[PDB]
């Protein structure tokens, strides 16, 4: 609602560097992707 989610997403932009084994931890999806765009709330994913 008042909350802009958390990850404010820029297109034509790069990601965050992940050059750590710990950083990597978790990236590997365990559950299927689910897209969720919304009015007043930014679009994100969940895997």
């Amino acid at each position: 609602a008042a909350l802009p989610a958390t990850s404010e997403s820029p297109v034509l932009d790069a990601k965050r560097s992940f050059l750590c084994r710990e950083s990597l931890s978790g990236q590997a999806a365990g559950r299927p992707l689910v897209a969720s765009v919304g009015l007043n709330v930014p679009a994100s994913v969940r895997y």
Partner: protein, 440 residues
Amino acid sequence: ATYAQALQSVPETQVSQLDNGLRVASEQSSQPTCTVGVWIDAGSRYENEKNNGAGYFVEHLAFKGTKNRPGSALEKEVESMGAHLNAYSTREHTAYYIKALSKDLPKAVELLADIVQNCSLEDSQIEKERDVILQELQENDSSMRDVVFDYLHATAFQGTPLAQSVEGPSENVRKLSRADLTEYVSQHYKAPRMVLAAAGGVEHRQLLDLAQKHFSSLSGTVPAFTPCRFTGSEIRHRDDALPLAHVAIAVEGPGWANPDNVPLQVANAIIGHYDSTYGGGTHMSSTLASVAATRKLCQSFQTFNICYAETGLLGAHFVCDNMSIDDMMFFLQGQWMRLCTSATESEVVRGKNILRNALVSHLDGTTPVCEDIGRSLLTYGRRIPLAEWESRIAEVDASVVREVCSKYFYDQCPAVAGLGPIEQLPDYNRIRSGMFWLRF
């Protein structure tokens, strides 16, 4: 159910205090889950320039091992019971919350009693974590938002411990030695500056007994920060290879208690947040959002209210292309002065509803509720009930907002932090001149 009844029918955050000074608190409502955490009152704010980054290092080393739980055994306890251990350390706070099932709340408390009091700080582990700290800092270099916010903190609170980053300088990361970490854990993890907060189905008496049976042997019953200063300046990291240019503008905000927080949070709520992947676009009541969607001059912008104890940063951060920074600054400043001079009732009502929804929706789940408890017991000194929050929102009106924005925004030297193709960004003189309106 008339809303106000629901706020009145919220379980109270029961709080007690041990002899050592541990502030134990719980919000037992219904759930079979819980989040139990110990919110330290440490962070990069309480660190000298030699010790900068020690808090981050301690946070990393906390979960590795303890004397009672050597190394992976600690992890073996967290995963085998289904618990999720996590930590977070900002500039003025540090916490280690272990989300778990309400049935096994005892063990978790014992586990927490291990992590915060009896750490390991193994030297080989210290080097292994030093390398990880270095590579993770190189990672955070890519994070444009974090980098810009650290730039803002450096340029605003220059010459003060607030300027120090959480991770610390890369030189320190290599120069920290086990003696420094032991001193930090023996000087900033003292019992008085501790908040043991638990949410979910956690009976308060059981929590108190567990704390008295696990956290008793702690420090008995000075470094207490220095009032930092605001210095209107700017850091411009012109780098024309980044596709977008992140800019953050802020002014000295209120203190942690500083009831002026409630009106300002409404005022910022009027500005709102916009990005490219939103819905309505050219329909939002926020004039900045509507204009941005009408011209696509914004990629993603939001209003932040980072608020420390003695001071705080209140402003907006926007991400856009190279040829739209000036239009941004113009519209952002113009809306700020519009709220400053003529705020009117309708958008004030919209901001009141927006803030109500923010506070209400944030406080769901054991982790956010426990975080609220731990942070409130440290900053405000009490858990401000949602009923009190509603009462403090209710009397905010157009005149109150028009006066608080006048006292915080009008004719105030700002702090600017730009990164990327920020050449279009106006110099400090034009930005400062934006904060006064000759038409007023």
